[PDB]
Ligand binder design. Sequence first.
Ligand code: NA
Lengths: 49, 48, 198, 66, 48, 66
Amino acid sequence: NGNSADAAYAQVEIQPRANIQLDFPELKPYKQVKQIAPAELEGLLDLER
Amino acid sequence: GQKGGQAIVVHPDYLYGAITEDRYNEYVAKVSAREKSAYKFFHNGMIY
Amino acid sequence: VMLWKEFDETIFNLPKNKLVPTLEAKRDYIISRLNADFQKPWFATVNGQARDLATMTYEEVAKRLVELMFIRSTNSWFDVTWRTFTGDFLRRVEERFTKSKTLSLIQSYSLLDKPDEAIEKVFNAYPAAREQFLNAQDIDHFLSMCQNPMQKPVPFVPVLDRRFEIFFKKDSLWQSEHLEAVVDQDVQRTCILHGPVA
Amino acid sequence: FDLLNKTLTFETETEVTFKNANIFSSVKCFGPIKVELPTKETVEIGIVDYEAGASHGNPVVDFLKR
Amino acid sequence: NLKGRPYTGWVDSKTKEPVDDKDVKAKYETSILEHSGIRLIEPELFNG
Amino acid sequence: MTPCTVSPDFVAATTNAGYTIELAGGGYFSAAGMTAAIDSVVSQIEKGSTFGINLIYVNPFMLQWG
Ligand code: NA
């Protein structure tokens, strides 16, 4: 059948390269993050302090 | 020399409870942009 | 050609030591004029907004390659080597964003003959790459693929550096016969050679 | 036939027809298979019989060569 | 160029032979661990 | 003329119109590439027709295969 028949057969493998990340924290959607803290906290703190 | 110390660190997601949805979403956008730029800076600074 | 003329009188005549400083000073203007007026646009411009390779996502780059190299009107890659380019580029995306050895989602660059779908396939598997600028190493790899001499000169300027004149002037005769593959099929961008007396 | 510790010889002719410069349209490879006796005399014990359409090669000669 | 062929990526600092990220662990991890963390004091790191 | 008379079609058309034309080496990068274009011109022109080739002296790579 020739080296053609079994060259259009043999899959192509992908080896990983490193992709170093800064790992900034994940920001969840507001609806979900507002459940964590009490409802009352909104506008209660001086955020400069 | 009697140097006692304690710090308490609280999870950062307790902060976002204090602000409005509008303000949070603006922050999330701004961080996301800054983070992409920091990754750009870091990898360039590392290899060179 | 009038931009080409200005750049002859303004940039390509400057002594080598003054080339790179003038390029950095007029950077935004040069990009603006390439995009507006020339047959090789600034590669790194996304939704008509100027960028650099370093400030485009893997997805933005893959899409920009298809935008400039794949001719919608003829539903084909203007040259097979341009397909090989964006094929090799997508394989890099898989390499960078896979966490371990797997089989490529592009087993044959044939798949690129429906390019929109090829892109969706790869970035659906590696969605992280929609949200991250090019790793600095992959910028150098992209710019290296652009120097590949076994391939039709890339139809854009990927970087402003010492070799700007070669990027600008290289392979600029064919566009007048293949407007279908020029940015707005716009004659006004292209080199047509013609005598003033004939 | 007990083949163990025997020496076989393969006396083979191969007839071929062509599709083009590279691909054969047909490939035939036949001839007797012989066993060596204690006397060193080779004796027929069977036959090679290969027949094929479009091939790129003769897999009998390839096998016997290796 | 690395021996007339063009190359982008890691290279062993001594040999200047190219190195794939996939091989970094097999090639260097044993040495990384041997010469990281709490270990015998290496004089070249503290002025002899 | 590079963009213009690189096209084997236009070379054949001009040759078939009964006028001498130069096939432009300018648009070719290998012996194999031009051999294919020449073959196309030959296939399109009448028996006993002819054309010429233009090579650029200032391009030593074209000269060395050309
Ligand atoms: Na990875």
